[PDB]
Design a protein around this ligand. Structure first.
Ligand SMILES: [Fe+3]
Ligand SMILES: [Fe+3]
Ligand SMILES: [Fe+3]
Ligand SMILES: [Fe+3]
Lengths: 287, 289, 289, 284
């Protein structure tokens, strides 16, 4: 088998859908956007709350629209705002609600199909705030850490705020030239290990300035992209798609990808890269 | 609450020896012994030689029978003997031959299904591959508790033959030193000497002696497991199924299925699984009842 | 011994010694603050330019006073403000300037004694060093909880300036969130965002907040510590001996000497030790009484 | 680099008739700035009480059959050339219930630990493990499933019969390195790392008429001739050597050998700590 087999097709969804909702490709009725990962959208209507649970599946939430909701992790709440990269770690209590006036929508991504082929699905229901909102900020997210922290699997940061993260990308355009494949791209980091925010999924935020025509890249990580702002086209080895704000597309293994933008576009992505790099199977080609 | 599915399976060596023979559980069509792992009986007949190739799927070969063939890795050849845990590490050239009489059969293990779902399948042909390293080279270099001061291996173990003469005598020395674990008997894990880790990044491999008359306690793990009976006989209990086993048989213990063994005869069980990947993702879990 | 001999003796200096000036305890003539670390006071006069070099000795610079000056590391330069914990990683070119008025003094900490004992002292002058990197480049690239994708690093925190204004705000933000640790106040370790570990391999660095009125319990650690009052005032009880402290002073707690505090104002202490080397060797130890 | 110690050599046999090995650091009781070395004798029928300290130590047997060292449960015979470890914070003792004097080369990290301030130690307020237990458990490329240890190799005697046979096996597998001959580092099978965190140990075989070229490293190294004879150069100041002699190459002093026999050299230094700090260097 020279070169990676498909396992997943290129795929586009224009954020004119419902408006929970699964997104799947060439894996019809497998509930999975990739062969490894799951993606879908989720709505919480005003007043709704959810009970708190825990499972081995890892999960990220990237907020699409709506303010006044919150997600809690292990007793701590964090406000969800547009573009926030919220995580709920793999064996930590989580729940949410909005006592607000706005429907709130987000992108969920979980490694359900991967945990399912590894055989490692466990889940339990809670039988308790105790944790001031905003705690994780100074405790883990200003380049310093408590003396006796101790964790294994982590990222005590469960909200990579957009206002922060977007700002990074913008400050970087004053400081150098864009990379010709990816624009101004950065990976979200676990400040305890320098590693991935979560063990199975890696996550990225990238800016592609107006008028950008990057080159062709391939990676082994089938990749779920999400347009947080901006617009233009993408080419996914051959197939082309037009994208506008809040669309979502998937780039399968070894499919060349390129971007041609007509606005300053900020793309969010995630994939099983960490699992690949852990085994020594990640591979990249810029051409 | 748990899950998981590859189904318990058994194959008897006498009713399957009349033959590569892929074996699947209840994933029929999927060329796979587990949801992540592939396993087969390979046969190389006197006079056969396979050209050199490389692929980033990791692989192991446990010799079931036959003497006189050799496997080669990145240069050096190694004789293949009954019970040898040989491996062809990931992106490193490999080939094999049988310049002897006697047909040589072994058990193949590959993380095929796993690399296909991850998307990382590359492979290529040697452009054979001259020897370079005297046969036997790796044993003083990497197998005697020392190591060269300036060596750059990578992801996998420079020992590509963990020999049974050596490994069967560990388990045997261990019985005159102490109690047998009550679930496992005398079980040990093969180890990469450069890192202390698993021999290959995606697969783990274990050997275990279960003394004659042994009746272990029930255990579960998250890592679905492929067992090979290298020697011995007895009964096994896999979550709701029970098999009688004998020399060379093969059985699979799917995730979170209770295993326990009942032995007549000192039985040596080789197995393997995708444990390293679950430990790498903080998903491995064990319950010993 | 039973408990660490450890020698450097308890010491206190007092910002009354205005003067490139180092501190020695009871190790006279060794230019050592402790048995592994050097500490002193360097002044840059309004106009000076240091040429640029690299050495195996790690170094930190913690600004005590004056404004206008900069330091550069591998090309990029940053402003120096009161309370800033700046590094010059080992084997990477560094220099500074003062194009301003106002003399600029800082505390130097370097692993000088240690590296001599270990035998690892290399020193190179640069041939006549340009910019390369705009000012405030490391901030968004490494200090905002994200990293570049193909970034190459080595043992070195790419963050060379842990600003005080961000750092002081952390400890403040901590007071609003919970009680004070009974032994340290509100204490945090500066962290290498690439690794999560120590900013330098031989040196560790802390910032703690000791609210007004606080009366800590007594603690001990094997790491001989250099404390520096960025602000505030109070008492310190360093194993049987006690010192009065005020803004900018420095004092040393030698290994396994009990340390406790009693502040009359909200106090903020900078400290560093050879902790990292002791943890790397599994020799670090603390008792919280 | 400065490196504060000097080149030293001691003629075994001369010295032979515990003994501390001090260079030009007169009084510091340290063969290097970081390590201590010395000979220890254990007369027939003498037994030492069990004790422990967070200082690391090794023992390389010089001579004498009979006798053993016990570590946390198990004892091991001491045979000429065996690299025995007493990991930090693990009870150790020894004894010989046989005839004959038992000499051994002592290596410890004492200067390092004082300079760091981490000296703790206990006088043991007892078997539990059969002799040779560690050999199948740890030293046959396998390991127990639920091992867990740290900061220490579970193998506590790297038998010279084995170690020596490695070096021998290697002369049949390829050529000598122009600098070291056939050299090799002992390893912790649980980590692939060094047997203890502060000290690294090597065994090298210098063939018959070998004549190495010049090397430098930043770790002050202690050599001990297990067998053979020859000359050594240590940044100037050469030395002629023979069985069981010991010498020291200070940091960034060039080292070379010229042998007349087929000689084996055991060595230990503070390399682990260096490389851990990113401070280790080497020139050929
Ligand atoms: Fe959930
Ligand atoms: Fe193959
Ligand atoms: Fe300097
Ligand atoms: Fe001792």
């Amino acid at each position: 088998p020279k070169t990676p087999n498909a396992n997943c097709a290129p795929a586009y969804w224009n954020y004119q859908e419902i408006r929970l909702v699964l997104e799947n490709p060439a894996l019809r009725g497998q509930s999975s956007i990739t062969a490894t990962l799951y993606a879908g959208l989720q709505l919480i209507m005003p007043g709704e709350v959810a009970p708190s649970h825990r499972h081995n599946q890892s999960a990220l939430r990237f907020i699409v629209e709506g303010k006044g909701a919150f997600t809690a992790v292990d007793g701590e709440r964090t406000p969800m705002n547009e573009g926030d990269f919220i995580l709920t770690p793999q064996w930590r209590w989580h729940d949410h609600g909005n006592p607000g006036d706005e429907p709130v929508i987000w992108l969920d991504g979980l490694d359900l199909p991967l945990v399912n082929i590894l055989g490692c699905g466990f889940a339990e229901d809670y039988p308790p705030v105790t944790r001031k909102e905003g705690d994780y900020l100074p405790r883990y997210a200003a380049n310093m850490l408590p003396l006796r922290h101790q964790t294994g699997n982590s990222s005590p940061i469960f909200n990579y705020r957009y206002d922060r993260s977007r700002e990074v990308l913008h400050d970087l355009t004053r400081l150098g030239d864009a990379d010709e494949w990816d624009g101004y791209k950065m990976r979200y980091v676990n400040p305890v290990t320098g590693g991935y925010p979560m063990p199975s999924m890696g996550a990225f935020l990238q800016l592609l300035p107006k008028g950008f025509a990057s080159r062709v890249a391939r990676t082994t990580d089938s990749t779920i992209y999400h347009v947080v702002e901006g617009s233009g086209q993408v080419i996914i080895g051959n197939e082309t798609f037009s994208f506008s704000a809040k669309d979502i597309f998937v780039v399968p293994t070894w499919h060349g990808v390129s971007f041609q933008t007509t606005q300053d576009s900020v793309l969010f992505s995630f994939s099983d890269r960490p699992v690949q790099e852990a085994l020594g199977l990640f591979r990249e080609a810029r051409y």
